[PDB]
Amino acid sequence: QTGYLTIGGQRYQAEINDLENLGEMGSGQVWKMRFRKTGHVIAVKQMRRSGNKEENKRILMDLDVVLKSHDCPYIVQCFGTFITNTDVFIAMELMGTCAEKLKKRMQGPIPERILGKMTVAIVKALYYLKEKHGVIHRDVKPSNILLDERGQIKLCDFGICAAYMAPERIDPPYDIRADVWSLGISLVELATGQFPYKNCKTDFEVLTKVLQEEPPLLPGHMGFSGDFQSFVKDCLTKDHRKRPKYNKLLEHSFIKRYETLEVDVASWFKDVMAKTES
């Protein structure tokens, strides 16, 4: 724990009392706060310190990774931590909302052009986590994909019908390829406005469906581009040994196209926010 909040490339001296509470955001505990010294509005997570040694280092270990991801623009930035007797406070850049909530606000699909930018960002985030830190995510899903009013899209981990788990994770006798599967499911969900696995009696039913049924692919009658359908189908390869790794996914036409294509995510996000409530 250093003595500073690091924000937009600068290091500001800080103490817990410099933070002013503007209200809770979640429903582990999350507050919108104002840093007095600068007026920057930030997101702060409050965690109780659990007395398990190993169970309290994976707190530290995961922070370590995010703190050292300043050079990746697709990962949510951590500004710093405050540790008191009972509590760790974790200060993060505030993102407007997550993809899950945009789906709800939309009451329907998110357009492909937005999803294309989201795909490049999330794939690059994961690739970065693997190559620079040797970590895997393990919970890729729409609620862990953050957007803001500057049109940025970033990967996060909130740590707290729908199923995103790869078949080989449901029932082993997992490496990066499980996250690839979770990306694909996420995309079908966001692109259709609908959970991919349809007839959801129970949790067991759904996990059985993942194991037994064919992957739910993008439907062909919604104008989805051929390369988006292909990308999703490659992510949703059941046999994990056949499933592409990130370097192969980064070579895919869908990605290459959306890297260069100018898309105005900012204005879209602003529109959506100005036209909806929760």
Ligand X SMILES: *CCC(=O)N1CC[C@@H](Nc2nccc(Oc3cc(C(=O)Nc4ccc(CN5CCN(CC)CC5)c(C(F)(F)F)c4)ccc3C)n2)C1
Annotated binding site for ATP: 25-30, 45
Distance CA 185, CA 164 (A): 6
Distance CA 151, CA 115 (A): 12
Q: Can residue 66 be called a binding residue for ligand X (CB under 6 A)?
A: yes
Candidate residues 64, 157, 227, 234; the one interacting with ligand X per rule CB under 6 A: 157
Q: Can residue 143 be called a binding residue for ligand X (CB under 6 A)?
A: yes
Q: Can residue 120 be called a binding residue for ligand X (CB under 6 A)?
A: no
Q: Which is nearer to ligand X, 158 or 195 (CB)?
A: 158
Distance CA 2, CA 4 (A): 6
Residue type present at position 115: L
Q: Can residue 138 be called a binding residue for ligand X (CB under 6 A)?
A: yes
Q: Can residue 92 be called a binding residue for ligand X (CB under 6 A)?
A: yes
Q: Which is nearer to ligand X, 103 or 209 (CB)?
A: 103
Candidate residues 97, 194, 208, 225; the one interacting with ligand X per rule CB under 6 A: 97
Of the residues 18, 62, 64, 139, which is catalytic?
Answer: 139
Q: Which residues contact 58 (CB under 8 A, 6 or more apart)?
A: none
Candidate residues 47, 59, 106, 135; the one interacting with ligand X per rule CB under 6 A: 135
Using the contact rule CB under 6 A, the part of the chain among 134-142, 169-177, 242-250, 262-270 near ligand X is 134-142
Is position 227 annotated as part of the catalytic site? no
What CA–CA distances, in Å, run from 207 to 137, 166, 188, 204, 234? 20, 10, 17, 5, 20
Cα dihedral 194, 196, 197, 198 sign: positive
Using the contact rule CB under 6 A, the part of the chain among 150-158, 230-238, 250-258, 260-268 near ligand X is 150-158
Q: Can residue 30 be called a binding residue for ligand X (CB under 6 A)?
A: yes
Q: Are 263 and 113 in contact (CB under 8 A)?
A: yes
Q: Can residue 178 be called a binding residue for ligand X (CB under 6 A)?
A: no
Q: Which is nearer to ligand X, 137 or 252 (CB)?
A: 137
Q: Can residue 140 be called a binding residue for ligand X (CB under 6 A)?
A: no
The set of catalytic residues is: 139
Q: Site residues (CB under 6 A) for ligand X? A: 25-26, 30, 43, 45, 62, 65-66, 75-76, 90, 92, 94-95, 97-98, 100-101, 129, 135, 137-138, 143, 146, 155-158
